[PDB]
Ligand binder design. Structure first.
Ligand code: OAN
Ligand code: NA
Length: 617
């Protein structure tokens, strides 16, 4: 009824459009940085200028994707989005963002949240809904109306360099569940939500930012695992699906000549009709907006021309070509005209039926209608909008929420003989060991705060940043003088040197600092009977690098503290747990493969301890 009227409205609006305006809607560029007339190279775009406004009016793009560069402050963001909607000549823009929460956030002053895998660790599907709801509220106040979230890739390859903690789980049901509820949470605030990255990027060991990944599983495994959370959310009302620049020869074994080396490469799903029309649109029944992942990524740009990529995606069935060309000043603006003209030539010849363009643009208009983008609802002043958004974005209540989720997500994997919590006597020396300066700064700040607040006795603190370092006598001396030692380990792909089950602790350089260094610190604390706790900070699989430790947590998020601000809540939440000020309730959303005993799991999915009793939760 409202759905029936919305489809007729989109049809009428599109029937009244020129081919140029229709192709424009199908493009979503970024203007992350810009080099205005007179400037010497592209700077962060935080305020609108009449140059960028002129390409929006010229080309009538359907929307713009914002990056951190564009959204550093709430004040500046409300003004940019008002200003953008001001430049769009006929139809309100989709203003989109990667506010995933956790390790992928953009909003300068917003609530960052622990991230998907921390949500998986917390289990409860209402927390994913509350995250999607709070993000949705913050984006709304800011005038951003699209979120490229949730990632519903299933992270079942622990060597995954691009997804990892951006996934809820290695388990299809947990991911599906938390994915559906994030989506509902966003759609509830009128934010269009995109599932990504279809048909499932969770098994790759290559980053599609850097080259073209291959998933070689059959259709039966692909339907039961990778597709699963997509189908559930598509049925449930998914607004949009984002594609994956990844090859699936079980789905489409069409090859193309790589612009790079002339070689035969399997097509990336983004550019396959079999996957985007056959599978997604038809078998899977998705009639919402298909959007490319960024076409600037090397998985695409290495092997396909610029115009040629855009044309091949649309031919495959996508509605929106995301980041089709990077134009950073007025002198490169013809890149856009060239994509538009290539599409026109494709319509003219009939390689892309103009009716296909119509159906695609209708979808886009209809989403803009469905989510209240069009007509533009708000009649407040920019000044009023900035006052209001200032009270909502990064609000105290929102922080309370992020604090609670981050603390619950904390997973304790070992705590022998009540090593945790640390209850330090006054004047104890606490050694903080972490890869980077911001991480040691975060742990220090949380501790300082704990002292300030009379939660713990006064201790002195010392830092040790070990990225690219070799463990030297100066370091062991610090461990020796320490009363308590807290060490953060950081891995993406876990690749310690190991020979017949023995992690090689004889390496005397710092190529393998990420595994060899923290293991060195451990071995010195254990040799000297120092209270020692290992906190895994990114991918949890490094838990296998410390079987000797008596205490060991994972927090699923690695960003620390710079410029007076915590860039994630996960490290503070683990530090609270360590000092007794928080109750971790987390259980592993993934298996941790044994390092000493290849082929065995060390900690099963769903394993996690009660920090007080030491019994599995
Ligand atoms: C696999 C993945 O992380 N793709 C992301 C993504 N990947 O592309 C880039 O942002 N551009 C790029 C950065 C470094 C190297 C090559 C391309 O872009 C989309 C929009 O920004 C995100 O929504 C997608 O999640
Ligand atoms: Na991709």
């Amino acid at each position: 009824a409202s759905a029936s009227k919305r489809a007729i409205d989109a049809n009428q609006i599109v029937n009244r459009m020129s081919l140029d305006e229709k192709l424009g809607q199908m493009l979503m560029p970024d203007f992350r940085n810009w080099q205005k007339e007179g400037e010497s190279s592209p700077q962060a775009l935080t305020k609108m200028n009449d140059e960028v406004a002129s390409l929006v009016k010229k080309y009538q793009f359907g929307g713009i994707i914002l990056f951190a560069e564009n959204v550093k402050t709430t004040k500046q963001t409300v003004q940019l989005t008002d200003d953008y909607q001001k430049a769009s000549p006929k139809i309100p823009l989709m203003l989109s963002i990667d506010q995933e929460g956790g390790i992928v956030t953009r909003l300068g002053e917003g609530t960052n949240f622990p991230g998907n895998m921390a949500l998986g660790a917390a289990r409860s599907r209402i927390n994913a809904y509350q995250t999607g709801s709070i993000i949705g509220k913050e984006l709304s106040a800011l005038g951003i109306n699209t979120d490229f979230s949730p990632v519903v890739d299933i992270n079942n390859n622990p060597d995954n360099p691009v997804i990892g903690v951006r996934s809820f789980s290695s388990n299809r049901e947990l991911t599906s569940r938390l994915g559906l509820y994030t989506m509902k949470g966003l759609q509830r605030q009128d934010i269009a939500s995109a599932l990504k990255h279809f048909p499932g990027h969770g098994d790759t060991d290559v980053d599609s930012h850097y080259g073209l990944p291959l998933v070689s599983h059959g259709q039966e495994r692909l339907r039961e695992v990778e597709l699963y959370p997509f189908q559930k959310a598509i049925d449930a009302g998914a607004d949009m699906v984002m594609t994956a620049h990844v090859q699936f020869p079980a789905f489409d074994d069409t090859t193309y000549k790589s612009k790079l080396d002339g070689s035969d490469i399997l097509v990336p799903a983004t550019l396959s009709k079999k996957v985007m029309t056959g599978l997604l649109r038809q078998e899977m029944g998705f009639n919402g907006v298909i959007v490319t992942d960024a076409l600037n990524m090397k998985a695409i740009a290495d092997h396909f021309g610029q115009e040629e990529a855009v044309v091949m995606a649309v031919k495959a069935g996508v509605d929106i070509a995301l980041m089709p060309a990077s134009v950073t000043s007025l002198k490169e603006e013809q890149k856009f005209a060239r994509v538009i003209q290539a599409l026109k030539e494709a319509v003219k010849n009939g390689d892309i039926p103009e009716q296909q363009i119509n159906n695609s643009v209708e979808r886009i208009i209809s989403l803009k209608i469905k989510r209240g983008m069009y007509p533009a609802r708000n009649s407040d002043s920019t000044k009023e909008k900035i006052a209001k958004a200032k009270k909502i974005v990064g609000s105290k209540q929102h922080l309370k929420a992020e604090k609670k989720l981050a603390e619950k997500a904390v997973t304790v994997l070992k705590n022998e003989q009540h090593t945790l919590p640390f209850k330090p006597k006054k004047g104890s020396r606490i050694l903080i060991v972490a890869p980077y300066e911001e991480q040691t700064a975060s742990i220090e700040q949380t501790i300082h705060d704990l002292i300030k607040r009379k939660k713990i006795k006064p201790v002195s603190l010392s830092k040790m940043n070990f990225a690219s370092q070799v463990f030297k006598t100066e370091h062991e001396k610090q461990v020796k003088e320490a009363d308590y030692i807290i060490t953060g380990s950081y891995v993406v792909k876990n690749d310690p040197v190991v020979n017949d089950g023995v992690i090689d602790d004889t390496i005397s350089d710092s190529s393998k600092w990420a595994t060899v260094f923290p293991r060195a610190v451990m071995k010195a604390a254990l040799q000297h009977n120092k209270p020692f706790v290992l906190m895994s900070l990114r991918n949890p699989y490094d838990a296998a690098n410390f079987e000797e430790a008596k205490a060991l947590i994972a927090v699923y998020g690695f960003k620390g503290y710079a410029n007076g601000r915590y860039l994630q809540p996960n490290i503070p939440a683990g530090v609270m747990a360590i000092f007794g000020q928080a109750k971790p309730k987390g259980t592993l959303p993934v298996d941790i493969p044994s390092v000493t005993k290849p082929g065995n799991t060390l900690y099963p999915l769903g394993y996690g301890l009660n920090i007080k009793t030491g019994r599995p939760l």
